[PDB]
Design a protein around this ligand. Structure first.
Ligand SMILES: Cc1cccc2c1C(=O)N(c1cc(-c3ccccc3)ccc1O)C2=O
Ligand SMILES: Cc1cccc2c1C(=O)N(c1cc(-c3ccccc3)ccc1O)C2=O
Ligand SMILES: O=c1ccn([C@H]2C[C@H](O)[C@@H](COP(=O)(O)O)O2)c(=O)[nH]1
Ligand SMILES: O=c1ccn([C@H]2C[C@H](O)[C@@H](COP(=O)(O)O)O2)c(=O)[nH]1
Lengths: 306, 306
């Protein structure tokens, strides 16, 4: 079934993955350079063995697709998935006792979840507060649609690439990179989703993602879904049908905390996977909003608390 | 045997690869996103089913490793493997009838192979002629060891990464990129070897290359060898033993010209693969020269004329 690759990567890690610690003291289990292939023509890669929230993944994807780096858009869609790093960089600004809320968010959750709601609402209406503290700066929206140059101009990689899909479907140069050597040695997040590339194959748009790093429990199921949604939107924009999504990792990992959770999931059997309908009268994935994107027949197993 | 992956990728392309034309009218056969794994501990990945010239591949590798982009070093080692693009950009300089020597190099080979030897020798001793025409500019040596920044400074990615292998073997951030979005829309060669990454696994240095594009006959056997040599040198520099080399492609292709050649090769059986000895008293891969690098037991089948 379409989502087996995800389940096989989960099992290959517990069984034969290697142990090492991390930047907090919790431990991982990992493997270098494992692929996953998902034929998009046989459905859509959202895990039925764990409810994944598609609502968020679209909001967050269209964000990137606007080239915005500002947590607001995310809030006005009820998506607090990037709150944290923004919040982070508001406690240590000269203007703010939530220092290291991370290492002890789980032992006080009545103050944080409230001082995070203060931040959230001031960002939600205060322009001058958003513009300073809502803006993540260097994140998928910039690298994808406004890569900062040398002679201080800006580049829309994804834009150019898309025209280039129209122009020369058969180019081997259809690449988008989130890896800026100049930004990564001092940076919030060195882009986990490193690099992707399109490829066009008698009618079908394919795409392959190079992902330097992956939390197989929390992160990968999401990633799989953005990047297929990404592959659908673009094929749609270019009049192409949908090929394969090909997911390649350097380091794919499980933290020792998630060992039991994933095991349970491993006991679940996949279900017929769903379908994407897209608004067949827009073909400008940049001015897409939520109702242009429809998931049909999503029948997951219960979410797994984590 | 160690080199089977190469033979399987060769067969998977003829059998089930898809047809398309290219930027000259000759045709390809290709497949998106195929991996290759080579355990370096069981030998060294130089094709026994076709003699590959290791002499060149080292010279060309140490070049990159010096961060030079100037064809001279290559010439004083008797390696004309990057001559062509330099020569190219000397015929159309304001100062030079060899215009489009490419599309008809094979129908006059007594004039070219001589006007290419003129270029070659003037570059070999004339400083002011080399500095203008010997310099490729934007190529593996710059991106790897001197990436041009925004505030006009320079970055040695590979350097920093190497210290970082020593420092934090277990980082998931051990990446080197040859893909500069600012340089690729107007450029000689948008780096075919896009991106690579290290990874450290109870003692063993691994490395995985993302290669956007590949001529499976002419290019890949070379590539495989540089990138294992690359993996050996660094492990050696960090006191690590040698893990896996993991070779990932976007578009891997065969041009229709090479269909018979490769078929013949496909009839050959691999042989015990060779061994690398390295000078066990240097550990500074940047000041390596040729005699510090030894291939033991290379027993290839004959080269294949192409
Ligand atoms: C605090 C901390 C520490 C290590 C590693 C990450 C973070 C973190 O906040 N993120 C992150 C996750 C997602 C994300 C989005 C959907 C699903 C799962 C994760 C999106 C943006 C992010 O910056 C990390 O990867
Ligand atoms: C002219 C032209 C046209 C298309 C594509 C390439 C070239 C070309 O000159 N090169 C190239 C090849 C190698 C190389 C090195 C060892 C083995 C095989 C190839 C090294 C540097 C290069 O720029 C192309 O990839
Ligand atoms: O979409 C995402 C985003 C982040 N991560 C996580 C996994 C890693 O723990 C971390 C990568 O950054 P480093 O740990 O390598 O610094 O991000 C994912 O798995 N998927
Ligand atoms: O080490 C190398 C260097 C170059 N190529 C070739 C194959 C492709 O024909 C070309 C890639 O550039 P584009 O054709 O995609 O423009 O370079 C290789 O296979 N291996």
């Amino acid at each position: 079934m379409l989502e087996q690759p995800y389940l096989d990567l989960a099992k290959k890690v517990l069984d034969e993955g290697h142990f090492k610690p991390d930047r907090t003291h919790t431990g991982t289990y990992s493997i270098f350079g494992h692929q996953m292939r998902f034929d998009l023509s046989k459905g859509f890669p959202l895990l039925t063995t764990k409810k994944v929230p598609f609502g968020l993944i679209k909001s967050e994807l269209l964000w990137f697709l606007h080239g915005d780096t500002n947590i607001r858009f995310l809030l006005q869609h009820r998506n607090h998935i990037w709150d944290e790093w923004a919040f982070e960089k508001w406690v240590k600004s000269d203007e703010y006792d939530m220092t290291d809320f991370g290492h002890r968010s789980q032992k006080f959750a009545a103050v944080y979840h409230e001082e995070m709601a203060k931040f959230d609402d001031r960002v939600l209406h205060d322009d001058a507060f958003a513009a300073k503290y809502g803006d993540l700066g260097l994140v998928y929206g910039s690298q994808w649609r406004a890569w900062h140059t040398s002679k201080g101009d800006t580049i829309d990689q994804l834009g150019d690439v898309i025209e280039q899909i129209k122009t020369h479907p058969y180019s081997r140069r259809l690449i988008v990179s989130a890896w800026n050597p100049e930004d990564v040695p001092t940076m919030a997040l060195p882009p986990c989703h490193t690099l992707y590339q399109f490829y066009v194959n008698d009618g079908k748009l394919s795409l392959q993602l190079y992902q330097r790093s992956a939390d197989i429990f929390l992160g990968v199921p999401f990633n799989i879904a953005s990047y297929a949604l990404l592959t659908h939107l673009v094929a749609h924009e270019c009049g192409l049908e949908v090929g394969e999504f090909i997911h390649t990792f350097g380091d794919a990992h499980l933290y020792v905390n998630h060992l039991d959770q994933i095991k349970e999931q491993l006991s679940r059997t996949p279900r017929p996977a769903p379908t994407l309908q897209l608004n067949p009268d827009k073909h400008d994935i940049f001015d897409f909003d939520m109702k242009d994107i429809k998931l049909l027949n999503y029948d997951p197993y219960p979410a797994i608390k984590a």
